[PDB]
Design an enzyme around this catalytic site. Sequence first.
Site, mmCIF file in Angstrom:
data_model
loop_
_atom_site.group_PDB
_atom_site.id
_atom_site.type_symbol
_atom_site.label_atom_id
_atom_site.label_comp_id
_atom_site.label_asym_id
_atom_site.label_seq_id
_atom_site.Cartn_x
_atom_site.Cartn_y
_atom_site.Cartn_z
ATOM 1 C CG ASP D 69 25.196 28.505 19.587
ATOM 2 O OD1 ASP D 69 25.290 28.141 20.780
ATOM 3 O OD2 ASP D 69 24.412 29.395 19.196
ATOM 4 C CD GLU D 196 18.435 23.236 22.723
ATOM 5 O OE1 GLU D 196 17.668 23.879 23.473
ATOM 6 O OE2 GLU D 196 19.482 23.730 22.241
ATOM 7 N NE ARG D 211 15.244 26.867 22.668
ATOM 8 C CZ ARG D 211 16.468 27.394 22.722
ATOM 9 N NH1 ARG D 211 17.491 26.686 23.183
ATOM 10 N NH2 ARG D 211 16.671 28.637 22.306
ATOM 11 N NE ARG D 286 18.795 30.731 27.576
ATOM 12 C CZ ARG D 286 19.380 30.185 26.511
ATOM 13 N NH1 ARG D 286 20.699 29.993 26.469
ATOM 14 N NH2 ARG D 286 18.629 29.823 25.477
ATOM 15 C CE1 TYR D 320 19.953 26.056 26.168
ATOM 16 C CE2 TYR D 320 20.895 23.963 25.408
ATOM 17 C CZ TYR D 320 20.345 25.206 25.136
ATOM 18 O OH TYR D 320 20.158 25.609 23.836
HETATM 19 C C1 G39 Z 1 19.961 26.135 15.797
HETATM 20 C C2 G39 Z 1 18.983 26.879 16.680
HETATM 21 C C3 G39 Z 1 19.139 26.550 18.164
HETATM 22 C C4 G39 Z 1 17.910 27.081 18.919
HETATM 23 C C5 G39 Z 1 17.743 28.588 18.811
HETATM 24 O O1 G39 Z 1 20.375 27.092 18.676
HETATM 25 C C6 G39 Z 1 20.762 26.594 19.975
HETATM 26 C C7 G39 Z 1 20.732 27.726 20.990
HETATM 27 C C8 G39 Z 1 21.452 27.728 22.134
HETATM 28 C C9 G39 Z 1 21.011 28.540 23.282
HETATM 29 O O2 G39 Z 1 19.920 29.163 23.220
HETATM 30 O O3 G39 Z 1 21.732 28.608 24.306
HETATM 31 C C10 G39 Z 1 22.722 26.910 22.236
HETATM 32 C C11 G39 Z 1 22.684 25.671 21.335
HETATM 33 N N1 G39 Z 1 24.023 25.109 21.268
HETATM 34 C C12 G39 Z 1 22.164 25.988 19.927
HETATM 35 N N2 G39 Z 1 22.152 24.798 19.093
HETATM 36 C C13 G39 Z 1 22.950 24.636 18.030
HETATM 37 C C14 G39 Z 1 23.003 23.244 17.473
HETATM 38 O O4 G39 Z 1 23.604 25.542 17.531
#
Ligand code: G39
Lengths: 385, 385, 385, 385
Positions: D69, D196, D211, D286, D320
């Site tokens: 990520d 988010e 979320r 998803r 997303y």
């Molecule tokens: C930091 C926890 C967060 C929610 C689980 O992770 C997200 C999950 C993601 C996901 O479930 O696809 C992708 C996002 N890019 C990520 N955010 C960051 C900033 O790393």
Amino acid sequence: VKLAGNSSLCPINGWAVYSKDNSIRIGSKGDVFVIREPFISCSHLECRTFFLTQGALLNDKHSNGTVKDRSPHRTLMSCPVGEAPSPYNSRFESVAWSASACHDGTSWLTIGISGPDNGAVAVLKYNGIITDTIKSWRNNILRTQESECACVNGSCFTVMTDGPSNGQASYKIFKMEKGKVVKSVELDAPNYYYEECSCYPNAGEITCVCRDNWHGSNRPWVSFNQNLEYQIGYICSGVFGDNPRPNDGTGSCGPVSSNGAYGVKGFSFKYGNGVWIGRTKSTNSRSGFEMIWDPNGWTETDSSFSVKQDIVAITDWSGYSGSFVQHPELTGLDCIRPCFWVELIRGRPKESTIWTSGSSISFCGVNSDTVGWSWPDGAELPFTI
Amino acid sequence: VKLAGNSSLCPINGWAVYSKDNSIRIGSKGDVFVIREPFISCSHLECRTFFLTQGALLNDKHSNGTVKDRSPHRTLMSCPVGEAPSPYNSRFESVAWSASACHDGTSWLTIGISGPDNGAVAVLKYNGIITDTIKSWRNNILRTQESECACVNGSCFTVMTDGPSNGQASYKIFKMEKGKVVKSVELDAPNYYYEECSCYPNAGEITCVCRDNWHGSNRPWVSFNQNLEYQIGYICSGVFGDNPRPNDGTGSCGPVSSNGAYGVKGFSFKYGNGVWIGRTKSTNSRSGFEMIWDPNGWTETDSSFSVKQDIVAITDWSGYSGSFVQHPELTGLDCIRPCFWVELIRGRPKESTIWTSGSSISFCGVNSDTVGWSWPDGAELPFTI
Amino acid sequence: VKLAGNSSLCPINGWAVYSKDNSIRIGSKGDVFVIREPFISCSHLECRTFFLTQGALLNDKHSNGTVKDRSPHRTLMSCPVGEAPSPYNSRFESVAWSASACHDGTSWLTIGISGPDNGAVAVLKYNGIITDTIKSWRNNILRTQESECACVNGSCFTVMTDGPSNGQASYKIFKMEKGKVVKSVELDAPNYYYEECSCYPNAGEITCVCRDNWHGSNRPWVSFNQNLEYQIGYICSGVFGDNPRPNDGTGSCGPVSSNGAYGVKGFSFKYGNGVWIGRTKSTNSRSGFEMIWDPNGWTETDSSFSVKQDIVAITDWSGYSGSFVQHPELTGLDCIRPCFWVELIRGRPKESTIWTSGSSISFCGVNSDTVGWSWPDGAELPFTI
Amino acid sequence: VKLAGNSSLCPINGWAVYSKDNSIRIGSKGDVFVIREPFISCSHLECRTFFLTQGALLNDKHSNGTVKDRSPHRTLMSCPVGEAPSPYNSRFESVAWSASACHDGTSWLTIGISGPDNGAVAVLKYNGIITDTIKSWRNNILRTQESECACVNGSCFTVMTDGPSNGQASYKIFKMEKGKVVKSVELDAPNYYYEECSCYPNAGEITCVCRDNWHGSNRPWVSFNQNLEYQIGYICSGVFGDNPRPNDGTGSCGPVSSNGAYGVKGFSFKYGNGVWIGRTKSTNSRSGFEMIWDPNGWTETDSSFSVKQDIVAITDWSGYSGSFVQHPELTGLDCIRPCFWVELIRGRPKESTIWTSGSSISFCGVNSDTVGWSWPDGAELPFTI
Ligand SMILES: CCC(CC)O[C@@H]1C=C(C(=O)O)C[C@H](N)[C@H]1NC(C)=O
Ligand SMILES: CCC(CC)O[C@@H]1C=C(C(=O)O)C[C@H](N)[C@H]1NC(C)=O
Ligand SMILES: CCC(CC)O[C@@H]1C=C(C(=O)O)C[C@H](N)[C@H]1NC(C)=O
Ligand SMILES: CCC(CC)O[C@@H]1C=C(C(=O)O)C[C@H](N)[C@H]1NC(C)=O
Ligand SMILES: [Ca+2]
Ligand SMILES: [Ca+2]
Ligand SMILES: [Ca+2]
Ligand SMILES: [Ca+2]
């Protein structure tokens, strides 16, 4: 407002490097057009490189046989000066295997010749819109400058040739306004040959230095009015400017017939009775390039000169070269600035490839310090293929 | 200020070459979209090529199966005329497997049809913003021009078809203003078939030349008001303009049923009771292209004509062709200028590849000298794959 | 209207990340130039990255031998900050193997040095048009900043060096207006060495922090008028800023001769008698990068400091770094904002490749919260080759 | 002039297809960025897609491990909507592994978070110039919307989260003007989880649908003033909108804890006490996407609804999704138009590749006819690698 073309050429001492596109080097990996006959032309706002593509990219199978001059696939396109000609940075101008282009201060005029050898048509576009047409009058490869046309006071001027390339042909000057032919004149030039003229404006007067493919190793010239009243001749210097040519010796103010057949597109800048000659270093092939100041060379027949500025070494390939100009309305100067470009040909016939292309370098006339060097193409052949 | 569309078509003698994109040749190495159904449309400032991508690049595995007409991945995009359609020079317009586009002087109107065969929706965008929607009314492949719509006095006009492609379908004309449908009319046209209309404005009046896929080897036409008051018919010339078609013979001012089924998108320009016909050279397949002046062909049934101008030779593939127009406000002319484009299809079904794509050439109507020739696609198939 | 350069440097607490081009990572597949000596310069409207190409793309055979510094093929080009330098997004500026560039509020000034080692010429361009030339006066590698020049009140200022790189050379400041040299001064600096100056404007006064390649592991400085009245010295901090250098200890307000030979282009921002020092983390090689606030380091000789902000970890390669500035007329601020870029060199001599290139990261001075981290180049070498 | 944000959401009946970039399909051959977390935001003049690159191209070795990520190489960039994100059409915005962006009518505001997990900093830029910074206050992955911020009357608004992703975290709303924080408020939301957020303006009031990664399979919401006076809750519909989630049943106007852990970024549009819910078709992964009109779903707990519009079939991957808006000053409408985008994720963890990326599709709210279908990513995996 229109480019006046009423001022004289700037005084200069030498040539400062202006651009280098590195096209062939980049086209080894980048998506770069196979081109030849490139040239530079400026407006009041920008300078563009125009070129004739072969409708094919370097290092691709469609570059096969690109030593061939004329095909339905050749197109005139342009991009900002010094950039590698790519389908992603290039503007489409015209379908053409012979071309000219210039800007009158308002819009781009382009001239594109396509069609069969025995009946080609020049398509004239003003601002990308077709404004006129010129049909072959001798039905034998209608052809034009392969450099910028000259504009004076909202009128632009070009030369075209029709007929054989090993004998007397027919030569015409065209005056156009807003992309429409308003006047034309056939040159009464027996024993002369005119082709691939490099034309520039000087105080309301146009001067063309051309290629005698027939029987001249020195270059022919036309100088003409906004009315198309003309004078003709050859450059008298014994510093011969064509390729092929003999060694320097006693000039003629007719064609020098040793090594007179064939030729290369070139240019010269008249400065009083003096002349700046751009020419190859080699006497036989399109190798090397140098600028020569001959203070009496327009009219005098000797082989002495004052100043050699190296541009490309004999060990490196050159090719076509041409004049371009930068007008006061672009530069802020009180004079019209002389510049030139050199096409650096790589591949066929001189090298073993399936293709022929060229890159470009360019230089501008300057009244400050300059230096000779070599700025060669720099690609290593052959390619993957 | 709005495009008037109030002036007549310019007098012309022939067609001068305007553009050639060399797309497939370049896409052998360059990142070029797999496309079909390209078309040209101009504003008051520029001309753009619109096209339907397959959401895939040439010489890539995703070009597999691209002979297939409709998918969720097809998109309408545009780039400057004469440039190879690339993801790096292309503007995204709409999600669409059938499309139309035109400019009213203010903004681009685009029409994109996507969705299932049994319920497709036309999405109308004005300046890239959704302004209206048209839903399938016969639930059988809603489809539109695949060329430019016509604009008169701030109103733009299009034709759509819904229903079978081997029988009577349903045909509608739509009048839209600022991308919104303000009026529409269903054509009462029994025994007629309308598809892939090439529509142009002429002195406040719109003329469409279309494709009879059902039972006509001559082309149907609609001419209509800004009010949508219409007249219908077929082109009477025995110089048949569809593909497939029989040999030239006695025309009909109904559908000529030999070789009437199927067809190709084409165009014609009405000039009084005369007609300029663009058609393939081959009678069976989409090969070659020629312009024909038939001075009495709109109304008279004979097979004689005055003028053939070659555009693509029989030995080379062509395909769709369509009209586009250049308005006075762009050209400075006192008349509306007729132009046409030809799609040059390569690959499936006629050649052994996994893909189908097309390149484009275009020409403009000119009242000066012109020449016939062949400007074919020029790609060598198959590709690496 | 002209950039005033009359305001002071903004108060700051640290450095916020501004850009990262990821060039080398992208050039593994993308068409990306092989470059070195990149730098950032802003106008009143935009910020551009300038760079010296090797006229070759990454992962192509022409990238062979690109550790070599000077060739006829090197060109100055620019693209928007943070974008990978590509032939499809890059503007051609000049033919150059050493360069400077800045914007006076009206037009871009560029300085490009090309030609032979024993007689190089600096070509000055204003708005892409040649306005002046400076010829080598010591005939030993004429060289300039490799970062932005400084502009005050419609005048721009640069430093050039000519002579040996292991002994006394000759150093000149040039004042230019509209790309023309109006004044220049040779520095009377015995025992000093000046090279690759990072120059910035501060309340009508220009400060340059440079590279002593001869015998200094601390950095020399010049501060000068719009009249070219100057003062000279070395940064006194025992936090030594060159590479190579000794460990931190007792500074000098002359050159610190341990580990004094060679060097790297760097920068520092004078804040009263304090100094922000950008330097590598490694003492020997161009590895890592950190910002250090030394509140008395301009004038005091101790090795203590207040604030380390990590920028690149020792385990990752860095290289050249330089100052750039953002003027009030671009930002709306009441002060001139300090920023810096770091070149992240990959390949030769430290790694086994046939090529040398660099990517860039950049940071801006901020009076709010910041954080140390590592933003390294991130490419995995070697390449396909 | 500033975007007012004073009008209400347009009445709509369904969603018309707006864009499809075909990014992954094109990136099989084209130079296309590996990205995730894309989103759309519009100004008064254009619409742009913003995205987080991995500083690497598709089908290149640097795409290895891109399921990860956060890295120093991730950057926020933008390109015109519907175009494949390429280094040749993309504008660099910020260094960021979490981002937000919006336009106030004058300039682009961007928010980029980079730095270490235990001390990340949000960098705010107005017109590409750094204007402010926000430091992590809980030192546990500072993170923001991954969609557009909302602007009302020259003020723009965003939500950020800091703390654990499997328990109570800390949530803040920020009000900024010209890229500077003028006010912020921490939400007193015990037992709630916010992440988010998809935020949109409605008659001077901002609504965020977010979320719950902690213990909610229905989505939480915040609605707030220009003063940051707020109300909080969860969407009551038994049509659960997160992924994962249980089957439709009896809703809560708290978090529905079956299948509550984890989640996906989503959105919803409040229409009185009704709600348009965008959600996946699959309950676990998803996969798929549908729009659901639930006329009482904001406040009522039942699982009945009026209208399903298919967008992506269960057999195809989604990911997303987020809201974006089109303001009257861009559209000419008297209301604010709701639109949404869906990210279509391909590769890891669900497929066997070394990489993870996403393409995008988008749709706009329309008061005319629409149709359900599937517009899936369409790439065939794996790649050459
Ligand atoms: C930091 C926890 C967060 C929610 C689980 O992770 C997200 C999950 C993601 C996901 O479930 O696809 C992708 C996002 N890019 C990520 N955010 C960051 C900033 O790393
Ligand atoms: C037609 C004769 C002419 C001079 C020999 O040929 C030129 C030679 C060329 C050359 O010597 O390089 C290239 C030119 N593209 C060509 N011109 C055309 C229009 O074909
Ligand atoms: C739906 C019937 C119609 C006429 C046969 O098919 C057309 C034929 C085509 C053709 O003959 O080349 C290509 C067109 N893209 C297609 N139109 C659509 C919308 O699918
Ligand atoms: C001429 C001596 C000088 C300092 C040692 O060399 C520089 C070293 C460089 C370096 O140490 O990385 C790269 C510079 N491009 C080069 N400058 C020129 C103009 O060649
Ligand atoms: Ca000759
Ligand atoms: Ca038919
Ligand atoms: Ca040193
Ligand atoms: Ca959840």
